[PDB]
């Protein structure tokens, strides 16, 4: 129990962590199931005890880095795992390794998840922190006070917007069966696929001009 | 195929083509000549040495001959009537005359009739398991005669 | 002063764009995406999909029709699937681009060809105007906006009382520097003496909450006295 | 609706769970695995961008003063309730309570607590400073005088507001009470959100269920085939399973792409509403509730936002 | 050279136009490839 093992019970195989369960199988029921027809519990054939199956811990492994143009020092995020299974910090996102935990909150530089961002800062190193939503401010509200501007500024802001794509076209025939007759004759058996793909791409290109 | 307007009509499946620009066909230049270049070797591969060997090795200690740096005329083999089984995988015998290879390995041995089927990709039995195993992705020919 | 601020702002745009490339991310992204979708497509030609080779001529030159048919069917299935994937991705991405282009057209109509009263549609500020600038596969708007800058506290009041009547401001707000009351436009501190030309009368003083007392100057009385 | 569930799928583990023969066959299909991962990662980053665009519309985090003298208007039901662990309002609590193999669910980048902080900031700004905190620096103004401006914005003179202040405040309070009652009583109000949730749930149930299918193979289980057949035939059976499961993954990813496009459209609309509706007073008809728009108050909700549109 | 032809170099078949190249092949390098993993340049089996 309590180890990642390759188990085989009477008919069924799997890989997981077997733990003492609190389920109440009926005397005849052999192995339990989830909503998604996924095996979640078994009965040990020799001892009539019920075991929960927890899948062996897995997850994405993400690398946090400033630019190589800046630094070669990085951090690692093991997603949605514990820090046991692997300067270490446990977060709602998983196990973060190579980043210093900091109480100070900043603007989000590299998002990690669940409110934790990371960045490279000053002796310099990578740091993790709860990201700051902004400078907290209270406004001097009262029933008889008003703030009026006495001056102003002219700002010019840039807004960039994509308008068109590259009008790509693909000759389905030449892509699949490049300059080959046997292949083209085989392709004919699939019906209208070639034409439909050409038509869709032509639609896109005309849309781009529009 | 009469004229481009007809190609358009045929592409759209209509007689009454509306104004526009239509992609109809694909222009492609046809090759004018056939070029065949092979390295200028004049050396028959020593197939006689292997097929006409006086005595053969046991299947468990099957002999392996390497073929390299020679011209292999496989017609001499596949046009002979001396072979009961000529089964080629991942290649067609006729095409062999048209192909080059870095190396050829001629693995020669002797077995009994009923085990000849075991000398083939993904076979089972005493021979295929314990004596001589072919890979599942074997690319070559198996030749056998009584 | 306004012209100088505008020129300074456009200069800052020049400097920002000359210095940092990241500004055009939204465009670069698009480009990159399509590039990837094509690299992927092309790379999917080098795959076997369970055939003996990923090249078609090798199969054709090695096998007889009865077997080359099977191998080529494997390749055809694979490559046709790859093309369908690419075309579907491109349809979805083109829908996204069409949304961006419809937004860009709406901005050029409501923002460039006009003056928009919609908040944050034409840059953060009070929209003054916008200037379009072409760009690879996109457009760039320079939004000129009026941003209030130096602010002062003032005591205020929703009306005043003159002769038991209540005067509300016509366009602006009543303000007080601590001693005298004025009325000013609400977006720029330009205090004015409260008169009957600056205010209107409605009802009496026993209703409004937070009303105050002051004197409303009648422009006619000085002229009559003179 | 603003965001979806940031789902991720390991194509390899989904198709060929912990199997080497299967994985080696899968290598023959090229980049399908990578491109599916890439598409889903696109979706998840888009989800974070949606939430950011909608809620992070204010640079500073305003808080209301301890004095709640808003000319007789009452905002206790929408401002944050300090007693609760998550700094959420009564109505946000109602809304949060009215919604219920290689597959991982990535957590959102902003926590519910941060979303609630953003809404609280927006609400405090809209209350204490009117529309000025959208333009730039927040400028205090008494709430009654703000309402006088909002009346001038729809062609009703300001005397009307001042002369009917108690009545207007009472009507507003009554309306917010009605909102409380509606949300406590009927759940169907939050259909648009629940639906989203359900959809994604279904798309995952379906995905997982497609593992129990044979697709014309001898079995739906991979180890059974490996332990029962010889390599030359187990390869064919596993190719059938791989084709089936890869098609199922492509189906799921395509549906998710389309659904993310729909959610992004909704989130762009929500951002536009928070800008033109909350941070301002919109003159567009029916964009900010049926009426003449006076103001609007945002309220977080699971995977979405809720606007209370105040209209004349 | 400089014609659309059906070429075969050592079993490597294709259709293309063969031109004098300026690529700096190494004494050992046999043929070259493009970003698409397609044959882009060859060495004549009879002539280096
Ligand atoms: C299978 O066999 C084992 C051993 O024969 C059984 O376990 C025994 O159970 C009794 C009753 O609780 C205990 O007193 C013994 O201490 C156990 N012995 C051992 C070696 O563990 C078990 O009950 C059997 N189960 C079935 C289903 O037949
Ligand atoms: C409004 O703001 C502008 C800019 O902040 C002020 O213009 C500046 O004036 C100071 C002192 O006169 C100079 O040092 C700067 O060079 C000016 N800047 C520009 C761009 O002209 C202006 O004084 C302010 N107006 C008021 C009434 O306070
Ligand atoms: C509030 O504004 C009034 C009017 O601008 C100020 O009164 C003037 O003060 C100046 C000198 O500060 C005198 O020369 C004028 O005679 C005053 N005008 C009138 C009509 O009496 C007043 O000082 C300001 N109060 C504060 C606290 O700034
Ligand atoms: C505003 O002015 C009016 C009129 O001068 C004030 O009303 C007076 O109130 C005082 C105090 O109760 C009474 O002694 C007078 O009899 C009232 N006069 C009239 C004509 O009603 C009012 O009090 C002033 N406002 C403030 C805040 O002092
Ligand atoms: C604003 O509205 C709330 C909600 O009706 C009021 O809160 C109630 O206040 C009374 C009196 O203290 C309590 O008995 C209730 O328990 C409160 N309701 C709830 C749901 O807690 C509040 O009084 C109002 N604020 C003002 C200033 O009138
Ligand atoms: C690295 O960044 C600096 C600015 O921070 C820039 O000037 C430089 O071009 C970058 N390095 C390279 C190799 O581009
Ligand atoms: C990590 O491991 C320890 C002991 O196994 C456990 O107490 C803790 O809850 C784990 N952390 C998480 C986040 O599961
Ligand atoms: C950071 O906060 C934690 C928990 O509040 C505390 O234990 C620690 O001393 C703090 N570190 C610093 C440097 O203030
Ligand atoms: C092998 O011997 C046979 C008969 O002696 C002959 O026909 C055949 O050509 C020989 N094979 C060679 C020379 O490769
Ligand atoms: C207005 O007064 C309050 C306190 O009375 C102060 O906190 C605030 O900074 C003042 N605002 C300005 C613009 O001076
Ligand atoms: C304004 O607030 C002060 C302090 O709370 C209070 O004494 C006064 O009655 C209020 N006046 C109005 C008009 O709201
Ligand atoms: C044969 O090939 C070699 C390659 O080095 C070349 O030197 C020689 O001239 C060629 N001879 C003939 C007859 O083709």
PDB file of C-alpha atoms in Angstrom, chain C:
ATOM      1  CA  UNK C   1       0.402  74.312 -24.272  1.00  0.00           C
ATOM      2  CA  UNK C   2      -1.983  71.749 -25.771  1.00  0.00           C
ATOM      3  CA  UNK C   3      -0.137  71.686 -29.088  1.00  0.00           C
ATOM      4  CA  UNK C   4       3.161  71.226 -27.275  1.00  0.00           C
ATOM      5  CA  UNK C   5       1.759  68.371 -25.210  1.00  0.00           C
ATOM      6  CA  UNK C   6       0.449  66.679 -28.339  1.00  0.00           C
ATOM      7  CA  UNK C   7       3.781  66.990 -30.134  1.00  0.00           C
ATOM      8  CA  UNK C   8       5.608  65.685 -27.068  1.00  0.00           C
ATOM      9  CA  UNK C   9       3.211  62.724 -26.916  1.00  0.00           C
ATOM     10  CA  UNK C  10       3.748  61.823 -30.565  1.00  0.00           C
ATOM     11  CA  UNK C  11       7.493  62.070 -29.999  1.00  0.00           C
ATOM     12  CA  UNK C  12       7.131  59.655 -27.107  1.00  0.00           C
ATOM     13  CA  UNK C  13       5.312  57.276 -29.435  1.00  0.00           C
ATOM     14  CA  UNK C  14       8.257  57.499 -31.837  1.00  0.00           C
ATOM     15  CA  UNK C  15      10.755  56.758 -29.069  1.00  0.00           C
ATOM     16  CA  UNK C  16       8.754  53.867 -27.628  1.00  0.00           C
ATOM     17  CA  UNK C  17       8.340  52.176 -31.005  1.00  0.00           C
ATOM     18  CA  UNK C  18      11.940  52.781 -32.057  1.00  0.00           C
ATOM     19  CA  UNK C  19      13.232  51.328 -28.789  1.00  0.00           C
ATOM     20  CA  UNK C  20      11.033  48.313 -27.963  1.00  0.00           C
ATOM     21  CA  UNK C  21       9.749  45.763 -30.493  1.00  0.00           C
ATOM     22  CA  UNK C  22       7.401  43.991 -28.033  1.00  0.00           C
ATOM     23  CA  UNK C  23       4.823  46.753 -28.659  1.00  0.00           C
ATOM     24  CA  UNK C  24       3.610  44.974 -31.810  1.00  0.00           C
ATOM     25  CA  UNK C  25       3.086  41.645 -30.050  1.00  0.00           C
ATOM     26  CA  UNK C  26      -0.538  41.337 -31.146  1.00  0.00           C
ATOM     27  CA  UNK C  27       0.639  41.319 -34.784  1.00  0.00           C
ATOM     28  CA  UNK C  28       3.808  39.290 -34.389  1.00  0.00           C
ATOM     29  CA  UNK C  29       1.747  36.648 -32.572  1.00  0.00           C
ATOM     30  CA  UNK C  30      -0.588  36.282 -35.565  1.00  0.00           C
ATOM     31  CA  UNK C  31       2.365  35.886 -37.924  1.00  0.00           C
ATOM     32  CA  UNK C  32       4.051  33.324 -35.661  1.00  0.00           C
ATOM     33  CA  UNK C  33       0.847  31.293 -35.334  1.00  0.00           C
ATOM     34  CA  UNK C  34       0.413  30.951 -39.084  1.00  0.00           C
ATOM     35  CA  UNK C  35       4.126  30.193 -39.472  1.00  0.00           C
ATOM     36  CA  UNK C  36       3.847  27.385 -36.931  1.00  0.00           C
ATOM     37  CA  UNK C  37       0.729  25.966 -38.556  1.00  0.00           C
ATOM     38  CA  UNK C  38       2.638  25.757 -41.803  1.00  0.00           C
ATOM     39  CA  UNK C  39       5.858  24.360 -40.375  1.00  0.00           C
ATOM     40  CA  UNK C  40       3.738  21.704 -38.653  1.00  0.00           C
ATOM     41  CA  UNK C  41       1.857  20.940 -41.869  1.00  0.00           C
ATOM     42  CA  UNK C  42       5.082  20.544 -43.843  1.00  0.00           C
ATOM     43  CA  UNK C  43       6.742  18.456 -41.116  1.00  0.00           C
ATOM     44  CA  UNK C  44       3.783  16.098 -41.185  1.00  0.00           C
ATOM     45  CA  UNK C  45       5.019  15.000 -44.596  1.00  0.00           C
ATOM     46  CA  UNK C  46       8.098  13.385 -43.048  1.00  0.00           C
ATOM     47  CA  UNK C  47       5.925  11.035 -40.974  1.00  0.00           C
ATOM     48  CA  UNK C  48       5.162   7.411 -41.756  1.00  0.00           C
ATOM     49  CA  UNK C  49       1.685   6.940 -40.260  1.00  0.00           C
ATOM     50  CA  UNK C  50       2.563   3.254 -40.100  1.00  0.00           C
ATOM     51  CA  UNK C  51       3.840   2.923 -43.667  1.00  0.00           C
ATOM     52  CA  UNK C  52       7.213   1.503 -44.649  1.00  0.00           C
ATOM     53  CA  UNK C  53       8.496   4.977 -45.551  1.00  0.00           C
ATOM     54  CA  UNK C  54       7.364   8.588 -45.367  1.00  0.00           C
ATOM     55  CA  UNK C  55       8.370   9.218 -48.988  1.00  0.00           C
ATOM     56  CA  UNK C  56       6.011   8.242 -51.770  1.00  0.00           C
ATOM     57  CA  UNK C  57       8.489   7.608 -54.575  1.00  0.00           C
ATOM     58  CA  UNK C  58      10.402   5.125 -52.403  1.00  0.00           C
ATOM     59  CA  UNK C  59       7.239   3.080 -51.840  1.00  0.00           C
ATOM     60  CA  UNK C  60       6.313   3.338 -55.509  1.00  0.00           C
ATOM     61  CA  UNK C  61       9.804   2.241 -56.583  1.00  0.00           C
ATOM     62  CA  UNK C  62      10.007  -0.615 -54.071  1.00  0.00           C
ATOM     63  CA  UNK C  63       6.623  -2.359 -54.016  1.00  0.00           C
ATOM     64  CA  UNK C  64       4.176  -3.845 -56.511  1.00  0.00           C
ATOM     65  CA  UNK C  65       0.723  -2.237 -56.944  1.00  0.00           C
ATOM     66  CA  UNK C  66      -1.003  -4.683 -54.545  1.00  0.00           C
ATOM     67  CA  UNK C  67       1.213  -3.575 -51.622  1.00  0.00           C
ATOM     68  CA  UNK C  68       2.094  -0.043 -52.620  1.00  0.00           C
ATOM     69  CA  UNK C  69      -1.667   0.510 -52.536  1.00  0.00           C
ATOM     70  CA  UNK C  70      -1.799  -0.376 -48.834  1.00  0.00           C
ATOM     71  CA  UNK C  71       1.247   1.707 -47.943  1.00  0.00           C
ATOM     72  CA  UNK C  72      -0.034   4.679 -49.930  1.00  0.00           C
ATOM     73  CA  UNK C  73      -3.444   4.317 -48.289  1.00  0.00           C
ATOM     74  CA  UNK C  74      -1.694   4.646 -44.938  1.00  0.00           C
ATOM     75  CA  UNK C  75       0.160   7.747 -46.097  1.00  0.00           C
ATOM     76  CA  UNK C  76      -2.957   9.224 -47.681  1.00  0.00           C
ATOM     77  CA  UNK C  77      -4.980   8.774 -44.503  1.00  0.00           C
ATOM     78  CA  UNK C  78      -2.227  10.401 -42.471  1.00  0.00           C
ATOM     79  CA  UNK C  79      -1.658  13.368 -44.744  1.00  0.00           C
ATOM     80  CA  UNK C  80      -5.334  13.980 -45.384  1.00  0.00           C
ATOM     81  CA  UNK C  81      -5.891  14.036 -41.635  1.00  0.00           C
ATOM     82  CA  UNK C  82      -3.037  16.516 -41.304  1.00  0.00           C
ATOM     83  CA  UNK C  83      -4.561  18.751 -43.951  1.00  0.00           C
ATOM     84  CA  UNK C  84      -7.980  18.626 -42.324  1.00  0.00           C
ATOM     85  CA  UNK C  85      -6.415  19.606 -39.010  1.00  0.00           C
ATOM     86  CA  UNK C  86      -4.622  22.546 -40.592  1.00  0.00           C
ATOM     87  CA  UNK C  87      -7.711  23.750 -42.443  1.00  0.00           C
ATOM     88  CA  UNK C  88      -9.872  23.543 -39.320  1.00  0.00           C
ATOM     89  CA  UNK C  89      -7.308  25.459 -37.275  1.00  0.00           C
ATOM     90  CA  UNK C  90      -7.136  28.064 -40.020  1.00  0.00           C
ATOM     91  CA  UNK C  91     -10.909  28.443 -40.155  1.00  0.00           C
ATOM     92  CA  UNK C  92     -11.082  29.064 -36.416  1.00  0.00           C
ATOM     93  CA  UNK C  93      -8.110  31.423 -36.496  1.00  0.00           C
ATOM     94  CA  UNK C  94      -9.633  33.298 -39.419  1.00  0.00           C
ATOM     95  CA  UNK C  95     -12.831  33.720 -37.434  1.00  0.00           C
ATOM     96  CA  UNK C  96     -10.753  35.295 -34.668  1.00  0.00           C
ATOM     97  CA  UNK C  97      -9.002  37.533 -37.198  1.00  0.00           C
ATOM     98  CA  UNK C  98     -12.351  38.520 -38.686  1.00  0.00           C
ATOM     99  CA  UNK C  99     -13.484  39.542 -35.225  1.00  0.00           C
ATOM    100  CA  UNK C 100     -10.354  41.672 -34.854  1.00  0.00           C
ATOM    101  CA  UNK C 101     -10.912  43.206 -38.273  1.00  0.00           C
ATOM    102  CA  UNK C 102     -14.550  44.007 -37.540  1.00  0.00           C
ATOM    103  CA  UNK C 103     -13.421  45.681 -34.335  1.00  0.00           C
ATOM    104  CA  UNK C 104     -10.750  47.570 -36.272  1.00  0.00           C
ATOM    105  CA  UNK C 105     -13.332  48.765 -38.789  1.00  0.00           C
ATOM    106  CA  UNK C 106     -15.658  49.833 -35.985  1.00  0.00           C
ATOM    107  CA  UNK C 107     -12.782  51.722 -34.391  1.00  0.00           C
ATOM    108  CA  UNK C 108     -11.893  53.431 -37.633  1.00  0.00           C
ATOM    109  CA  UNK C 109     -15.484  54.538 -38.086  1.00  0.00           C
ATOM    110  CA  UNK C 110     -16.402  55.512 -34.541  1.00  0.00           C
ATOM    111  CA  UNK C 111     -12.947  56.626 -33.462  1.00  0.00           C
ATOM    112  CA  UNK C 112     -11.098  58.075 -36.466  1.00  0.00           C
ATOM    113  CA  UNK C 113     -14.021  59.284 -38.579  1.00  0.00           C
ATOM    114  CA  UNK C 114     -15.749  60.548 -35.440  1.00  0.00           C
ATOM    115  CA  UNK C 115     -15.319  61.294 -31.746  1.00  0.00           C
ATOM    116  CA  UNK C 116     -16.392  58.437 -29.519  1.00  0.00           C
ATOM    117  CA  UNK C 117     -18.239  58.896 -26.239  1.00  0.00           C
ATOM    118  CA  UNK C 118     -17.832  55.220 -25.378  1.00  0.00           C
ATOM    119  CA  UNK C 119     -15.498  54.755 -22.435  1.00  0.00           C
ATOM    120  CA  UNK C 120     -12.157  53.039 -23.152  1.00  0.00           C
ATOM    121  CA  UNK C 121     -13.164  52.257 -26.730  1.00  0.00           C
ATOM    122  CA  UNK C 122     -10.780  54.906 -28.081  1.00  0.00           C
ATOM    123  CA  UNK C 123      -7.958  54.831 -25.568  1.00  0.00           C
ATOM    124  CA  UNK C 124      -8.028  55.418 -21.835  1.00  0.00           C
ATOM    125  CA  UNK C 125      -9.144  59.009 -21.391  1.00  0.00           C
ATOM    126  CA  UNK C 126     -11.748  61.324 -22.756  1.00  0.00           C
ATOM    127  CA  UNK C 127     -11.446  60.683 -26.469  1.00  0.00           C
ATOM    128  CA  UNK C 128     -10.363  63.630 -28.571  1.00  0.00           C
ATOM    129  CA  UNK C 129      -9.380  61.982 -31.850  1.00  0.00           C
ATOM    130  CA  UNK C 130      -7.449  59.076 -33.278  1.00  0.00           C
ATOM    131  CA  UNK C 131      -5.039  58.657 -36.173  1.00  0.00           C
ATOM    132  CA  UNK C 132      -4.675  55.370 -38.062  1.00  0.00           C
ATOM    133  CA  UNK C 133      -1.367  53.956 -39.196  1.00  0.00           C
ATOM    134  CA  UNK C 134      -0.940  50.899 -41.361  1.00  0.00           C
ATOM    135  CA  UNK C 135       1.151  47.965 -40.200  1.00  0.00           C
ATOM    136  CA  UNK C 136       2.002  44.455 -41.413  1.00  0.00           C
ATOM    137  CA  UNK C 137      -1.286  42.505 -41.314  1.00  0.00           C
ATOM    138  CA  UNK C 138      -2.921  45.063 -39.069  1.00  0.00           C
ATOM    139  CA  UNK C 139      -3.628  48.653 -38.179  1.00  0.00           C
ATOM    140  CA  UNK C 140      -2.363  50.917 -35.425  1.00  0.00           C
ATOM    141  CA  UNK C 141      -4.421  53.664 -33.836  1.00  0.00           C
ATOM    142  CA  UNK C 142      -2.887  56.630 -32.083  1.00  0.00           C
ATOM    143  CA  UNK C 143      -5.643  57.719 -29.716  1.00  0.00           C
ATOM    144  CA  UNK C 144      -5.453  61.310 -28.536  1.00  0.00           C
ATOM    145  CA  UNK C 145      -7.272  61.668 -25.231  1.00  0.00           C
ATOM    146  CA  UNK C 146      -7.800  64.406 -22.664  1.00  0.00           C
ATOM    147  CA  UNK C 147      -6.729  63.326 -19.177  1.00  0.00           C
ATOM    148  CA  UNK C 148      -7.382  65.574 -16.151  1.00  0.00           C
ATOM    149  CA  UNK C 149      -4.124  66.024 -14.345  1.00  0.00           C
ATOM    150  CA  UNK C 150      -3.899  68.375 -11.344  1.00  0.00           C
ATOM    151  CA  UNK C 151      -6.840  68.183  -8.974  1.00  0.00           C
ATOM    152  CA  UNK C 152      -7.971  70.254  -6.024  1.00  0.00           C
ATOM    153  CA  UNK C 153     -10.366  69.559  -3.192  1.00  0.00           C
ATOM    154  CA  UNK C 154     -13.345  71.870  -2.911  1.00  0.00           C
ATOM    155  CA  UNK C 155     -16.366  72.006  -0.677  1.00  0.00           C
ATOM    156  CA  UNK C 156     -19.478  71.586  -2.784  1.00  0.00           C
ATOM    157  CA  UNK C 157     -23.259  71.716  -2.568  1.00  0.00           C
ATOM    158  CA  UNK C 158     -26.100  70.566  -4.829  1.00  0.00           C
ATOM    159  CA  UNK C 159     -27.908  73.913  -4.802  1.00  0.00           C
ATOM    160  CA  UNK C 160     -27.948  77.261  -3.014  1.00  0.00           C
ATOM    161  CA  UNK C 161     -30.652  79.475  -1.536  1.00  0.00           C
ATOM    162  CA  UNK C 162     -31.136  83.085  -2.557  1.00  0.00           C
ATOM    163  CA  UNK C 163     -34.686  84.166  -1.637  1.00  0.00           C
ATOM    164  CA  UNK C 164     -36.082  80.863  -0.434  1.00  0.00           C
ATOM    165  CA  UNK C 165     -35.773  79.565  -3.994  1.00  0.00           C
ATOM    166  CA  UNK C 166     -33.249  76.900  -4.934  1.00  0.00           C
ATOM    167  CA  UNK C 167     -30.744  77.565  -7.710  1.00  0.00           C
ATOM    168  CA  UNK C 168     -29.147  74.647  -9.427  1.00  0.00           C
ATOM    169  CA  UNK C 169     -26.266  75.091 -11.871  1.00  0.00           C
ATOM    170  CA  UNK C 170     -27.079  75.044 -15.554  1.00  0.00           C
ATOM    171  CA  UNK C 171     -23.941  73.210 -16.650  1.00  0.00           C
ATOM    172  CA  UNK C 172     -21.348  72.779 -13.933  1.00  0.00           C
ATOM    173  CA  UNK C 173     -21.142  72.477 -10.166  1.00  0.00           C
ATOM    174  CA  UNK C 174     -21.184  74.802  -7.207  1.00  0.00           C
ATOM    175  CA  UNK C 175     -17.829  74.916  -5.430  1.00  0.00           C
ATOM    176  CA  UNK C 176     -16.255  76.776  -2.548  1.00  0.00           C
ATOM    177  CA  UNK C 177     -12.641  77.614  -1.808  1.00  0.00           C
ATOM    178  CA  UNK C 178     -13.649  78.021   1.845  1.00  0.00           C
ATOM    179  CA  UNK C 179     -14.939  81.586   1.822  1.00  0.00           C
ATOM    180  CA  UNK C 180     -16.798  82.406  -1.410  1.00  0.00           C
ATOM    181  CA  UNK C 181     -19.014  80.199  -3.537  1.00  0.00           C
ATOM    182  CA  UNK C 182     -18.524  79.828  -7.275  1.00  0.00           C
ATOM    183  CA  UNK C 183     -19.873  77.683 -10.071  1.00  0.00           C
ATOM    184  CA  UNK C 184     -17.547  75.889 -12.438  1.00  0.00           C
ATOM    185  CA  UNK C 185     -17.651  73.445 -15.302  1.00  0.00           C
ATOM    186  CA  UNK C 186     -17.153  70.001 -13.909  1.00  0.00           C
ATOM    187  CA  UNK C 187     -14.111  68.856 -15.917  1.00  0.00           C
ATOM    188  CA  UNK C 188     -11.771  71.826 -15.440  1.00  0.00           C
ATOM    189  CA  UNK C 189     -11.532  74.320 -12.600  1.00  0.00           C
ATOM    190  CA  UNK C 190     -12.703  77.642 -14.038  1.00  0.00           C
ATOM    191  CA  UNK C 191     -14.661  79.260 -11.201  1.00  0.00           C
ATOM    192  CA  UNK C 192     -17.284  81.835 -12.078  1.00  0.00           C
ATOM    193  CA  UNK C 193     -19.508  84.119 -10.048  1.00  0.00           C
ATOM    194  CA  UNK C 194     -22.903  82.528  -9.476  1.00  0.00           C
ATOM    195  CA  UNK C 195     -25.622  84.428 -11.334  1.00  0.00           C
ATOM    196  CA  UNK C 196     -29.019  83.816 -12.894  1.00  0.00           C
ATOM    197  CA  UNK C 197     -27.318  83.234 -16.246  1.00  0.00           C
ATOM    198  CA  UNK C 198     -25.323  80.359 -14.731  1.00  0.00           C
ATOM    199  CA  UNK C 199     -28.182  78.748 -12.803  1.00  0.00           C
ATOM    200  CA  UNK C 200     -31.869  77.930 -12.912  1.00  0.00           C
ATOM    201  CA  UNK C 201     -34.541  77.991 -10.215  1.00  0.00           C
ATOM    202  CA  UNK C 202     -36.683  75.062  -9.089  1.00  0.00           C
ATOM    203  CA  UNK C 203     -38.979  75.044  -6.080  1.00  0.00           C
ATOM    204  CA  UNK C 204     -37.887  76.181  -2.645  1.00  0.00           C
ATOM    205  CA  UNK C 205     -35.249  75.435  -0.027  1.00  0.00           C
ATOM    206  CA  UNK C 206     -37.142  73.034   2.232  1.00  0.00           C
ATOM    207  CA  UNK C 207     -36.741  69.977  -0.012  1.00  0.00           C
ATOM    208  CA  UNK C 208     -33.199  69.644  -1.337  1.00  0.00           C
ATOM    209  CA  UNK C 209     -30.689  67.872   0.905  1.00  0.00           C
ATOM    210  CA  UNK C 210     -27.372  69.569   1.535  1.00  0.00           C
ATOM    211  CA  UNK C 211     -28.472  72.883   0.062  1.00  0.00           C
ATOM    212  CA  UNK C 212     -26.566  75.937   1.281  1.00  0.00           C
ATOM    213  CA  UNK C 213     -27.008  79.697   1.349  1.00  0.00           C
ATOM    214  CA  UNK C 214     -25.296  82.166  -0.926  1.00  0.00           C
ATOM    215  CA  UNK C 215     -26.092  85.215  -3.004  1.00  0.00           C
ATOM    216  CA  UNK C 216     -27.003  84.828  -6.666  1.00  0.00           C
ATOM    217  CA  UNK C 217     -25.967  87.898  -8.633  1.00  0.00           C
ATOM    218  CA  UNK C 218     -28.523  89.284 -11.057  1.00  0.00           C
ATOM    219  CA  UNK C 219     -26.791  90.988 -14.008  1.00  0.00           C
ATOM    220  CA  UNK C 220     -29.804  93.209 -14.684  1.00  0.00           C
ATOM    221  CA  UNK C 221     -29.856  95.070 -11.359  1.00  0.00           C
ATOM    222  CA  UNK C 222     -26.460  96.818 -11.845  1.00  0.00           C
ATOM    223  CA  UNK C 223     -27.568  97.968 -15.292  1.00  0.00           C
ATOM    224  CA  UNK C 224     -30.861  99.304 -13.960  1.00  0.00           C
ATOM    225  CA  UNK C 225     -29.107 101.088 -11.079  1.00  0.00           C
ATOM    226  CA  UNK C 226     -26.526 102.583 -13.455  1.00  0.00           C
TER     227      UNK C 226
END
